PDB file of C-alpha atoms in Angstrom:
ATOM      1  CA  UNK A   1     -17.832  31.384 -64.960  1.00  0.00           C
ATOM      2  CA  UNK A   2     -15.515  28.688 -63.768  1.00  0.00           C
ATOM      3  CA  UNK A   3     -12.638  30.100 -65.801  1.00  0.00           C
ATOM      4  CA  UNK A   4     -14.162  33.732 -65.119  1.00  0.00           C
ATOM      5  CA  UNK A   5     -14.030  33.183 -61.428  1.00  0.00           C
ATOM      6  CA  UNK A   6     -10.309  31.686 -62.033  1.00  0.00           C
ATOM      7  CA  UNK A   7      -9.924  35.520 -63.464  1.00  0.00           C
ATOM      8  CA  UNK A   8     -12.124  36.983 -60.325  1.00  0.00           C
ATOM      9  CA  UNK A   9      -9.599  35.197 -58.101  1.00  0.00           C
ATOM     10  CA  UNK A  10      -6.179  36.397 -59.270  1.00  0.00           C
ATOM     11  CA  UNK A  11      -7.280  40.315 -59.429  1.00  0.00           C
ATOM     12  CA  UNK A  12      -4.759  42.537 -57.773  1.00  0.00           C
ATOM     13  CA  UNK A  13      -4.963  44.925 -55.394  1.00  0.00           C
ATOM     14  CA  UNK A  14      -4.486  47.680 -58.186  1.00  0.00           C
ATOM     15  CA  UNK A  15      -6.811  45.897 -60.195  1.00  0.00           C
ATOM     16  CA  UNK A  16      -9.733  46.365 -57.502  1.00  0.00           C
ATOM     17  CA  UNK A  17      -8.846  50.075 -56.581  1.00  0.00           C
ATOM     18  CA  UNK A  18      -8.778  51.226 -60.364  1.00  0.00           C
ATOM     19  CA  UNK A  19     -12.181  48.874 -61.227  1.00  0.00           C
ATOM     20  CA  UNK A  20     -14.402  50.411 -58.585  1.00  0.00           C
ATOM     21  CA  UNK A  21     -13.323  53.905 -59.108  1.00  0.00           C
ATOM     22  CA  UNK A  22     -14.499  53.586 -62.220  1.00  0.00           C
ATOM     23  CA  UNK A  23     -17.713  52.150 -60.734  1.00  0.00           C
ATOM     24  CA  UNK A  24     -18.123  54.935 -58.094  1.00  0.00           C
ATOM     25  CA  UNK A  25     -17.152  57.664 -60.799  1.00  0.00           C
ATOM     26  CA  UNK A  26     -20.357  55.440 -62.896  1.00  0.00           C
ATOM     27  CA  UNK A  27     -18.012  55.078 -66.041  1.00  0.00           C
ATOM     28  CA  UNK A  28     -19.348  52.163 -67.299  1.00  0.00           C
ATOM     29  CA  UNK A  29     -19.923  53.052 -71.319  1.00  0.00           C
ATOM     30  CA  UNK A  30     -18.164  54.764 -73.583  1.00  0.00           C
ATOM     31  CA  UNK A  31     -20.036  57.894 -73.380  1.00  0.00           C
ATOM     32  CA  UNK A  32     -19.109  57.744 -69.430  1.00  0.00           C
ATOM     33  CA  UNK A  33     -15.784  56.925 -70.164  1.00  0.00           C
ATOM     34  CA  UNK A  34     -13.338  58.910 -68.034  1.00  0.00           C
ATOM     35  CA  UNK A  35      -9.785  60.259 -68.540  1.00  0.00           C
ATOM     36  CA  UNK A  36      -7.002  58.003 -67.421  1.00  0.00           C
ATOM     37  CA  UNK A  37      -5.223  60.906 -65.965  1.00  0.00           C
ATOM     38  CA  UNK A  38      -8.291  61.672 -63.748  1.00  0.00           C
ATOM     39  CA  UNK A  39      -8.154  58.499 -62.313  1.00  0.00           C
ATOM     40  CA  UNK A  40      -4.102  58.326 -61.626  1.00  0.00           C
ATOM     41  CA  UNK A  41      -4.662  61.425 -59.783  1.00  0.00           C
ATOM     42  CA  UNK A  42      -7.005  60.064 -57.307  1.00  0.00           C
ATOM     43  CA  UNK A  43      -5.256  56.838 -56.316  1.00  0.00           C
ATOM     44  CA  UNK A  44      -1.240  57.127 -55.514  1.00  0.00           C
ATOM     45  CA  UNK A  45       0.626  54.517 -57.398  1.00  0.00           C
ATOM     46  CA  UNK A  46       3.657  54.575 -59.542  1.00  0.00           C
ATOM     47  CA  UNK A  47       3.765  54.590 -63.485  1.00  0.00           C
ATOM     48  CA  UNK A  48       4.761  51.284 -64.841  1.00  0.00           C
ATOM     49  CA  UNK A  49       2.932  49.940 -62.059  1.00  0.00           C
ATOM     50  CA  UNK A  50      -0.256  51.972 -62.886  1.00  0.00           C
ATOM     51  CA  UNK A  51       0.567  51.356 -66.754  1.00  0.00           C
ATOM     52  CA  UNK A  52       0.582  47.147 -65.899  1.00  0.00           C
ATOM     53  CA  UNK A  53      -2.496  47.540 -64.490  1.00  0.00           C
ATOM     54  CA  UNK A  54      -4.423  49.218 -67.539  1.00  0.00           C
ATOM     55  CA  UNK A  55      -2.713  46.833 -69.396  1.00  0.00           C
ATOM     56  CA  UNK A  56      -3.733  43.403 -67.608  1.00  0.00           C
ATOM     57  CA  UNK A  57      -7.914  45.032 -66.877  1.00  0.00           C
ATOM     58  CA  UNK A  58      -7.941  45.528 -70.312  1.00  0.00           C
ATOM     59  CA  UNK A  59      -6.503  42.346 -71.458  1.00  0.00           C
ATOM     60  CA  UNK A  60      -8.726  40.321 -69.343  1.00  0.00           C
ATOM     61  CA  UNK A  61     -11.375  42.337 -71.346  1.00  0.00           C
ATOM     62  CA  UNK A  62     -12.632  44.021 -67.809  1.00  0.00           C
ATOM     63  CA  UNK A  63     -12.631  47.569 -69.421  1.00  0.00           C
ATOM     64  CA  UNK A  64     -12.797  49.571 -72.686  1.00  0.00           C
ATOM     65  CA  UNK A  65     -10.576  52.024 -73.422  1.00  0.00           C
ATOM     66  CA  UNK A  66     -11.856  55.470 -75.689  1.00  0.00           C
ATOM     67  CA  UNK A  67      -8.758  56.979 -77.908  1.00  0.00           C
ATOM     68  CA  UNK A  68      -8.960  59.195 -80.338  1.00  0.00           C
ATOM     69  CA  UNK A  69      -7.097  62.684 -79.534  1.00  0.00           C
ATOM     70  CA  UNK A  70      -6.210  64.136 -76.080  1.00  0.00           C
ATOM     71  CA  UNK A  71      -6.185  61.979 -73.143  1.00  0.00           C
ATOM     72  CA  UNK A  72      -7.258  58.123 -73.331  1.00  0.00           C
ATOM     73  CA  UNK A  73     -10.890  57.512 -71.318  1.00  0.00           C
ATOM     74  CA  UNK A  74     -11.830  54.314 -69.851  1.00  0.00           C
ATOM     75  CA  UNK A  75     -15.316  52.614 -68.746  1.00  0.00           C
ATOM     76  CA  UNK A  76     -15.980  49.176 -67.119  1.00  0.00           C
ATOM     77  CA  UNK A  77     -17.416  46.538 -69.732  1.00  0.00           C
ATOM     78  CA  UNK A  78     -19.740  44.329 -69.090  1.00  0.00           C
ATOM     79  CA  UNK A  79     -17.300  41.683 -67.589  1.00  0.00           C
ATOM     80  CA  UNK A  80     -15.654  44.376 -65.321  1.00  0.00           C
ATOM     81  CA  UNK A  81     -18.728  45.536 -63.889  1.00  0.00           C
ATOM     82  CA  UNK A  82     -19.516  42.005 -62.784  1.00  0.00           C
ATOM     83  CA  UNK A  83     -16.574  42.324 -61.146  1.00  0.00           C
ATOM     84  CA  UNK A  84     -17.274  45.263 -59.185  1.00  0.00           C
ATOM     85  CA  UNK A  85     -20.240  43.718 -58.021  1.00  0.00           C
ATOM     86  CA  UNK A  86     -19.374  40.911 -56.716  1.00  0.00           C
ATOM     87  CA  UNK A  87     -15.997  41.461 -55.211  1.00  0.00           C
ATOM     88  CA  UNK A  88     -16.694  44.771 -53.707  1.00  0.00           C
ATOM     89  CA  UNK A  89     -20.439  44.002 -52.981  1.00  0.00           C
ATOM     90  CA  UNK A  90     -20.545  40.234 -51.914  1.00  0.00           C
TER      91      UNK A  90
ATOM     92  CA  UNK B   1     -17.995  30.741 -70.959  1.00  0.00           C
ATOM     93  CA  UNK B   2     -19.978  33.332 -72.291  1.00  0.00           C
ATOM     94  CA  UNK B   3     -17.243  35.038 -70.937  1.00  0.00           C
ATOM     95  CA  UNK B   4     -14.277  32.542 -71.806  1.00  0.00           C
ATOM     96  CA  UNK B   5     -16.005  33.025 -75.763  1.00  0.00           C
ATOM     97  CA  UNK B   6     -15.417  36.561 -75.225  1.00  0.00           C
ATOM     98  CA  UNK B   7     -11.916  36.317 -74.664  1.00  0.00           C
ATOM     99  CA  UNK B   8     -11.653  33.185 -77.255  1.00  0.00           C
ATOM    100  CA  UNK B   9     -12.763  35.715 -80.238  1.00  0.00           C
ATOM    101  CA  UNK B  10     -10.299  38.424 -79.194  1.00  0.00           C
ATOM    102  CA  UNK B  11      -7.143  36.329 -79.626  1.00  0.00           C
ATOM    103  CA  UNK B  12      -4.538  37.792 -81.881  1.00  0.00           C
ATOM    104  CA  UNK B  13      -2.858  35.446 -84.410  1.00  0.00           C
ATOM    105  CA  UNK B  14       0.767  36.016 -81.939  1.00  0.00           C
ATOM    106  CA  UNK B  15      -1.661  34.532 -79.262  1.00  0.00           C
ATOM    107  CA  UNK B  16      -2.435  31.251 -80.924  1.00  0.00           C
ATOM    108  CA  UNK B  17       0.701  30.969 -82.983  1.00  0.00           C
ATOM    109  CA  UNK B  18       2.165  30.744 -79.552  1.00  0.00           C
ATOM    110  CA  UNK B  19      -0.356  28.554 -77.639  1.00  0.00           C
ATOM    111  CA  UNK B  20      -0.142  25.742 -80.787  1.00  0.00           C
ATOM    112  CA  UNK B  21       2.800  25.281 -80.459  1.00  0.00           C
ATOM    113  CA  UNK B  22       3.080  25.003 -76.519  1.00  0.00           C
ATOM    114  CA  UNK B  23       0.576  22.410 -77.392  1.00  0.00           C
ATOM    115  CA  UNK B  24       2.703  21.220 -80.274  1.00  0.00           C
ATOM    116  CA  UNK B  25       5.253  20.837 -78.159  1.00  0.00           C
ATOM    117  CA  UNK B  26       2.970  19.213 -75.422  1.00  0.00           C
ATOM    118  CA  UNK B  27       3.810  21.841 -72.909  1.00  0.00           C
ATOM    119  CA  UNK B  28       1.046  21.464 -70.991  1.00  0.00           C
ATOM    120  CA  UNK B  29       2.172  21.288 -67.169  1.00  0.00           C
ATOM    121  CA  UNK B  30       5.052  22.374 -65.422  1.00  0.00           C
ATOM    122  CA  UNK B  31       7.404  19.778 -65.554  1.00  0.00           C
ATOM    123  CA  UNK B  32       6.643  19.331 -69.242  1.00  0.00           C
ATOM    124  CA  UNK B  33       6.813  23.603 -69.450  1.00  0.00           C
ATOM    125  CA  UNK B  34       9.340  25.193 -72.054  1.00  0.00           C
ATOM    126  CA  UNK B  35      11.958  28.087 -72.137  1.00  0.00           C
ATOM    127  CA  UNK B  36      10.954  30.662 -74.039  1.00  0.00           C
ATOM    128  CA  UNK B  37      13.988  30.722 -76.180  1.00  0.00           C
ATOM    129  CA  UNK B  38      12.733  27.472 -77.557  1.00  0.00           C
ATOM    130  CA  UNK B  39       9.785  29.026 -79.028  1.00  0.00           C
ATOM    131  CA  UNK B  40      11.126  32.411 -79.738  1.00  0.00           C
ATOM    132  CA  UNK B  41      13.824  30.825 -82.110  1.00  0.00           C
ATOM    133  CA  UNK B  42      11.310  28.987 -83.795  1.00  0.00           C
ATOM    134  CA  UNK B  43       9.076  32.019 -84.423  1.00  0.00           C
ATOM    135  CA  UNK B  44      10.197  34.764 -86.373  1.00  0.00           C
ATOM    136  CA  UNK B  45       8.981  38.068 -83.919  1.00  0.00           C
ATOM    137  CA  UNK B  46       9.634  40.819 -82.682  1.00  0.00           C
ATOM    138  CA  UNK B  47      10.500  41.528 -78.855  1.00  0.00           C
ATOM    139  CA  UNK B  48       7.992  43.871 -77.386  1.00  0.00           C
ATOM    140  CA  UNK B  49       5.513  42.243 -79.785  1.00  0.00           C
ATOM    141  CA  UNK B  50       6.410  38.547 -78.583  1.00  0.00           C
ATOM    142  CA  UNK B  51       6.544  40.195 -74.587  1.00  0.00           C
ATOM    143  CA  UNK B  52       3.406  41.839 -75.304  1.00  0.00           C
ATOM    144  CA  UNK B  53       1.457  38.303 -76.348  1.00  0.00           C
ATOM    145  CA  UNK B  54       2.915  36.646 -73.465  1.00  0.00           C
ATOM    146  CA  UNK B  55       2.388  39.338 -70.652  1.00  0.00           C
ATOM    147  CA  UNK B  56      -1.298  38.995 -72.155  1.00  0.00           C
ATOM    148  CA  UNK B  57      -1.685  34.958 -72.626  1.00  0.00           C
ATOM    149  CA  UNK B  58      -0.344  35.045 -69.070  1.00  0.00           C
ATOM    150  CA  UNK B  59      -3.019  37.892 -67.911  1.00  0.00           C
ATOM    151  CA  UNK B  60      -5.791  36.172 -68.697  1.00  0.00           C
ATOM    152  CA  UNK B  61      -4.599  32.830 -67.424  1.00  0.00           C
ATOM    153  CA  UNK B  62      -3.883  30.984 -70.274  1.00  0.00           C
ATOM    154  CA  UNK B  63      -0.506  29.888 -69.792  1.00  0.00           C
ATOM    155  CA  UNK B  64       1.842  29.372 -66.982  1.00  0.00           C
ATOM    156  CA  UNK B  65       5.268  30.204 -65.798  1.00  0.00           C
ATOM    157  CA  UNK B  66       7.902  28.453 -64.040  1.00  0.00           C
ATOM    158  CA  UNK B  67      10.271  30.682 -62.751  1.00  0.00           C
ATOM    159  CA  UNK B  68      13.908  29.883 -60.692  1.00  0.00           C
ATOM    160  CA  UNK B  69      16.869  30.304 -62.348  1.00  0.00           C
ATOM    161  CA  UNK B  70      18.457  30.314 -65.937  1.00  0.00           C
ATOM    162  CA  UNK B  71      15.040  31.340 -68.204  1.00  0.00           C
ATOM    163  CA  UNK B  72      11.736  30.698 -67.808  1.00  0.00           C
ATOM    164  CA  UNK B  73       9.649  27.953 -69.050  1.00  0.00           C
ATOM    165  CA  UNK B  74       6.031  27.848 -70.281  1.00  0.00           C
ATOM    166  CA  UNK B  75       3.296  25.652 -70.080  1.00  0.00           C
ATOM    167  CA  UNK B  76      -0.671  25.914 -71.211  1.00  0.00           C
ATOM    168  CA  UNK B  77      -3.416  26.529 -68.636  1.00  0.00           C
ATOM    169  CA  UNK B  78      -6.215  24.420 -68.311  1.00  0.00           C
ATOM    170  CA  UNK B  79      -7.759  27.298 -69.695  1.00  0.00           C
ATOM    171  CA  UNK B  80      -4.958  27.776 -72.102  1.00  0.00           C
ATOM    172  CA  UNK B  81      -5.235  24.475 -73.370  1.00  0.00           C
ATOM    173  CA  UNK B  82      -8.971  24.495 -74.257  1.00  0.00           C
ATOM    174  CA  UNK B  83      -8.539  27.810 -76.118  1.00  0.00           C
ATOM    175  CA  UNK B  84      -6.458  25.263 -78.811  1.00  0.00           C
ATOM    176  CA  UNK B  85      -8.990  22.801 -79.002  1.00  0.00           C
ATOM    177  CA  UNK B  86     -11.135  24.722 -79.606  1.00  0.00           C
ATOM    178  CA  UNK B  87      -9.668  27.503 -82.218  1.00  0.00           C
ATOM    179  CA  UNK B  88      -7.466  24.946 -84.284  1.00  0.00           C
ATOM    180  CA  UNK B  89      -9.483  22.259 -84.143  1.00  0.00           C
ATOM    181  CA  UNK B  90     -12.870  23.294 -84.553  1.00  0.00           C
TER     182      UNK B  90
END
């Protein structure tokens, strides 16, 4: 809480855009997941600059990522939905 | 905290080889920060797999950088520096 609002204050503009997507599109568990690809081609950003992004959110352990085969799917965990709510919301 | 033990149990063994020996090396603010040459040279990695760890240990705030000229040096967090009482210690 004190280091998770350290995290909270150093989140990126990318980092917010990408987060409550996610939130708006409701993927918040694994069965919600959603295709990265679905997202990239709703919000205009680069690659390696979309690409850092994935990779900090889901360092920080703010969302979970679904492989297997075709694309990769993402949801918010419980950590990133906090997020959403209180950035966006309050 | 609940959160910070979250991100405590999903270090790698890169991730604290690393951090120990920042704190080894007591480089734990930024005029007492190292190059990272100093620590590659003294652990036997990869590249991408030692710029992986510390684009992560950086993400979630567990180290810092100091930038300018010639390479860059690296100090532990507050944050950072827990994490190694903690794991080694205890």
């Amino acid at each position: 809480s004190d280091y998770f609002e350290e995290v909270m204050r150093k989140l990126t503009i990318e980092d917010v855009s990408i987060l409550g997507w996610l939130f708006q599109n409701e993927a918040n568990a694994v069965f919600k997941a959603i295709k990265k690809s679905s997202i990239a081609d709703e919000l205009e950003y680069s690659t390696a600059n979309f690409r850092k992004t994935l990779n900090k959110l889901e360092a920080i352990h703010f969302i979970g990522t679904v492989t297997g085969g075709k694309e990769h799917k993402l949801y918010l965990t419980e950590y990133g939905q906090q997020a959403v709510q209180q950035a966006i919301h309050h």
